[PDB]
Write a protein that binds this ligand. Structure first.
Ligand code: HEM
Ligand code: HEM
Ligand SMILES: Nc1nonc1/C(=N\O)Nc1ccc(F)c(Cl)c1
Ligand SMILES: Nc1nonc1/C(=N\O)Nc1ccc(F)c(Cl)c1
Lengths: 368, 372
């Protein structure tokens, strides 16, 4: 009834639980820049401060939490440096003294050297009062890009949806051991509890409107999350000075990098990685290694869908269809969020096709 | 190992594969058992059309499902490439396309001939009481006469089986890391590297039984897929199973779980990084049998042997670990020579530079993992 060392916490699931906040003193030269990105980009001195930097060693980042915090600090500094004010004064070469420890640390954690969902959502937060529970008022992100980027809202809302699904993930072992022992009654309870938590997760998703402005997102934040895989601004990729001879390409942030949704697609026999199936497959590369491992474990198990269909059991079939419907709801609301935050401010098509097909693949998986 | 379908003696190979299908399918088997003669006469493509959408349901157990997947897979290649002179068909007939895709999605494999089919499930012993060697062994199917396919497939198979006796050690390695039996672990690593050096010695046989021209000109053509292939630039239409064309990669020994297995075990980070090699090797898993994908998965979800060895500051262990990494480096380095002989040189009398960079980078990634 538990998962091993997939780094899946009981309460926060795929999130890094109570992330680190400060680095060892050695790195105060790094942490400074990260703690003041909005103010350094305005003054136009971010890049100078980056380029006047010593090549620090990663070795004093001893444990996992600090290694991550550092990965976030560096990741943000990188985004900021590459996009600048985010008007077009890009850079195509990342400075030696930052590029080196970033790629070192990245290949140490088996993650790509670019800011990802695992960094700016999953490891970018804290409680205000540690004795109070997890909720937007009691919570705050550690780093931001610009003032009025609404990044506190964007990151936390996302995080809170992840944590909502966390209380459904801890059920999965119960599901499989129920399929084994044949304890039909349990299995039903488990499936129902999962769908409950996913409907919850939608209710949490509603908060996005309250804390993220459409223009603030599309115009400001979106820019700093952009990568260099197929990006015309850096059509060859980015040169990582002192680590790679040639440019390299890496995808910007997406919540395709959230293990939550892929996890439940897998669990429920929703065959989405078998084009989109390609994107979604690639996005795993940007998930923390243990989480990739976890999704993997799920695929190497017996199909819950098969099990339910064999049993000719109305109760089950509903319970299963309940979960599939919860996902269908989540993706459908998602499309509305994209309409509001990308599609409309883009005004003053291919992307909608992508999301619509994924949802559709989810809806086909119903038993009806 | 549980039900990863990894046999003790033949590893990833399908052990003692089926040879005949139920009588219902004698209309398939026929074509498969005579592909060389039907392509010559130019009647293969007729015989394929004049065919009746049979049902897959009489293929009850795994071994028969696989034999059928091979029969169909070969028939498909043969039909698509024809005489292999450059007339290619772009629509696979309904009465074969349907049961092929049915069976393929039943075994969770792509509907195209793959290493798992034409190497791992395409053989038999001549005398069942005699051991596994080229003289006592034979493939079940072939494409043309003088394609040297018996040699190509069996040599490959025999290398797989050589690495099989190293795979059965892996559980010993991990349970040694746990119980902290340093001595056990050393023995295990050494035994692994031994079996991989063996596997190279077996690889040597390729020169004896495969002709370079017979391979590059004949056999290579029938193993080609339609992923990024200009001949079928959109992919292939599977009549009665898919609206649009679909793309699928041709046979590669990138589809051998052996090498990816040991890369994983030894902390050799190939399927990570930006480039085309990591992505290719990651894709190729899709073309491995499902239980073998599952197995590679397990290995990644274990503690890193590399880490464990580096922590210990132990000369013996390092040497044992480096032994294995060296064995792989050797295998890949010989591999490059085989490519030079069989693709690179005959390609000369009729680009592949980019192609050699690929293999060279993979090997190089293997050589960097060395400790000393
Ligand atoms: C304004 C906020 C958001 C925008 C503009 C947005 C936009 C998009 C876009 C464009 C894609 C597909 C292409 C790409 O990622 O580049 C996508 C996919 C996805 N988004 Fe979002 N998204 C937002 C918020 C969220 C949130 C809060 C979640 C979950 C908590 C989420 C989950 C996903 C998932 C899981 C996918 C992959 C497709 C799928 O799983 O069905 N997104 N989103
Ligand atoms: C003898 C003729 C062979 C030729 C012409 C050949 C050619 C090639 C080519 C062209 C590739 C790159 C794949 C692509 O981009 O299409 C490749 C990869 C590979 N080949 Fe071969 N190969 C041969 C035999 C073997 C054998 C016998 C083995 C092992 C038993 C082997 C193991 C591999 C592996 C493992 C890869 C993936 C790269 C790697 O893991 O290092 N090959 N081969
Ligand atoms: N992709 C995206 N591009 O912009 N927002 C999204 C989105 N879902 O797709 N997810 C996403 C949501 C919040 C985030 F902070 C990040 Cl880094 C990624
Ligand atoms: N790739 C390849 N394309 O042709 N031969 C190879 C090769 N290694 O790369 N291995 C391989 C060896 C024997 C085979 F039958 C097949 Cl289908 C693939």
């Amino acid at each position: 009834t538990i998962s091993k060392e997939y780094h899946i916490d009981e309460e926060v699931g795929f999130a890094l639980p109570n992330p680190q906040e400060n680095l060892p003193d050695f790195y105060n030269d790094w942490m400074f820049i990260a703690k003041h990105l909005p103010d350094l980009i305005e003054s136009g001195q971010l890049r100078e401060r980056v380029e006047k930097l010593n090549m620090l060693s990663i070795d004093h980042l001893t444990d996992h939490k600090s290694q991550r915090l550092a990965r976030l600090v560096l990741g943000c500094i990188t985004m900021a440096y590459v996009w600048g004010k985010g008007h077009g004064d890009v850079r195509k070469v990342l400075p030696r003294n930052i590029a080196v420890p970033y790629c070192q640390l990245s290949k140490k954690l088996e993650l790509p050297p670019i800011l990802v969902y695992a960094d700016c959502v999953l490891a970018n937060w804290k409680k205000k009062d540690p004795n109070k529970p997890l909720t937007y008022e009691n919570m705050d992100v550690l780093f931001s890009f610009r003032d009025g980027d609404c990044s506190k809202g964007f990151f936390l809302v996302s995080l809170l949806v992840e944590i909502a699904a966390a209380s459904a993930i801890k059920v999965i072992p119960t599901v499989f051991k129920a399929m084994q022992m044949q304890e039909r009654d349990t299995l039903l309870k488990a499936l129902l509890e999962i769908a409950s938590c996913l409907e919850k997760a939608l209710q949490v998703f509603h908060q996005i409107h309250d804390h993220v402005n459409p223009k603030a997102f599309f115009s400001v934040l979106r820019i700093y999350l952009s990568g260099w895989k197929g990006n015309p601004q850096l059509s060859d990729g980015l040169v990582y000075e002192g680590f790679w001879e040639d440019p390299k390409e890496f995808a910007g942030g997406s919540a395709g990098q959230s293990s939550v949704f892929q996890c439940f697609d897998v669990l429920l026999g929703i065959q989405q990685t078998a084009h989109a199936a390609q994107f979604l497959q690639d996005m795993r590369r940007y998930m923390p290694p243990a989480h990739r491992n976890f999704l993997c474990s799920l695929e190497s198990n017996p199909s819950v869908r098969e099990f339910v269909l064999s049993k000719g059991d109305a109760g089950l079939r509903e319970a299963y269809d309940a979960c599939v419907k919860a996902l269908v709801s989540l993706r459908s609301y998602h499309l509305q969020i994209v309409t509001k935050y990308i599609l409309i401010p883009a005004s003053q098509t291919d992307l909608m096709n992508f999301l619509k097909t994924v949802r559709s693949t989810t809806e086909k998986s119903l038993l009806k």
